A paper describes a structure:
To acquire the structural information of the missing dimer head, we determined the crystal structure of [name] [name] (KpZapA) at 1.8 Å resolution and performed a structural comparison of [name] within the [name]-[name] complex with the crystal structures of KpZapA, E. coli [name] (EcZapA, PDB code: 4P1M18), and P. aeruginosa [name] (PaZapA, PDB code: 1W2E10). The cryo-EM structure of KpZapA within the [name]-[name] complex was superimposed well to the crystal structures of KpZapA and EcZapA (r.m.s.d. = 0.851 Å among 128 Cα atom for KpZapA, and 0.911 Å among 127 Cα atom for EcZapA). For the dimer head on the missing side, KpZapA and EcZapA overlapped well, but PaZapA did not. The N-terminal tail of [name] in our cryo-EM structure, which is sandwiched by two [name] molecules, overlaps with the C-terminal tail of KpZapA and EcZapA. This observation indicates that the C-terminal tail of [name] moves aside to accept the N-terminal tail of [name] when the [name]-[name] complex forms. Furthermore, the α1-α2 loop of [name] undergoes a conformational change to recognize the N-terminal tail of [name].
Cell division in most bacteria is regulated by the tubulin homolog [name] as well as [name], a [name]-associated protein. In the presence of GTP, [name] polymerizes into protofilaments, which further associate into a ring-like structure (the Z-ring). [name] binds [name] straight protofilaments preferentially to crosslink [name] protofilaments; thereby, [name] bundles more aligned and straight filaments constituting a coherent Z-ring. A [name] protofilament has polarity and lacks symmetry, while [name] is in an equilibrium between homodimer and homotetramer, which are related by C2 and D2 symmetry, respectively.
Residue numbers in the entry:
A (entry chain A), B (entry chain A): 4 to 109
C (entry chain B), D (entry chain B): 2 to 45, 49 to 109
């Protein structure tokens, strides 16, 4: 299903089903913007060099996002365990107090 | 509203509205049983002495129950604070991870 | 080891066997019963007065026990509510963590 | 302080300015991009191949961000659920702790 795209003055063709077309348009728009911003802050105007550097940057950004995902998950596991421990403490306390043996004088 | 009761061979009269009558019957039954059990384990058969000792025992039992109530409450306040602290930690963590600044090469 | 303790309760000398570890509690019970008997006499035979005071304390103790029961029942619900939150968090983690990625080509 | 680093990416020598604290990340990015470009060439001009690889990574990064968002949304609900449990516990404590006692007489 060949889709023709224009990114940073370059003609690309990519096979893409219609269900992914909006995502493809968004990615084309993202990569266009990335290359424009990279060109601005580095003054490089060679396109092939720009796209290599952009691809390395975005690769690193994906690794960084996956770490954020992993870190959020690791933190949530701990929070859940902490919650479960407060339930266990609630039951232990309830037991400790409720089983208190009564006293009498005689 | 005079109610005539029989407890441990003694005739009592107590003013008691109808809305409290079941509670009065239950209390009469409780004090009857208490005096019978006290007589069994102490061998005392003087009624006035038994009822004095029973009243002291039950006074102490009420103080003991009120302590249980106070203790349960003190424990629950702590458990609630512990729960609230896990919520606060959840928000702090979320913030810590989510505000992580991204890196790029160039 | 229980030793006899002489108490004064509402005009009446009373001997009670009590271990020293409970002596303070005994004094406190004697003080509580003395105050109850005095108040009762004003509101209303010593022996009959003590039966009536013991009935009142019985009812108060029943009421205090109902408070214990009602705290416990209430907390059973709270724990069920927290456990449901934990079970959902775990489920959501699995649902999100397991989604397959897509690519174009 | 960024220094130029010579890399080899899919047959192409490339100079990238990178601070030493990010050198390992750069090597890892180069390895990831090299593997992507190879796989892509098998599935499917170097420059065009790199545009396509960058499109794929863009989409994957968008998808990874949606996971972050979806975890956050899910947790907002979980926190609301816990806060509701806390508010109820406090309310119940007050309700029970404040009940007036009764007596007979
Ligand atoms: Cl009373
Ligand atoms: Cl790819």
């Amino acid at each position: 299903q060949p889709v023709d795209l224009q990114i940073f003055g370059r003609s690309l063709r990519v096979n893409c089903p219609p269900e992914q077309r909006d995502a493809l348009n968004q990615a084309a728009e993202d990569l266009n913007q990335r290359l424009q911003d990279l060109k601005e802050r580095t003054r490089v105007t060679n396109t092939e060099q720009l796209v290599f550097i952009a691809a390395l940057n975005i690769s690193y950004e994906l690794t960084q996002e996956k770490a954020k995902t992993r870190d959020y998950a690791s933190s949530m596991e701990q929070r859940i365990r902490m919650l479960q421990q407060t339930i266990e403490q609630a039951l232990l306390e309830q037991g400790r107090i409720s089983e208190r043996p009564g006293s009498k004088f005689e």
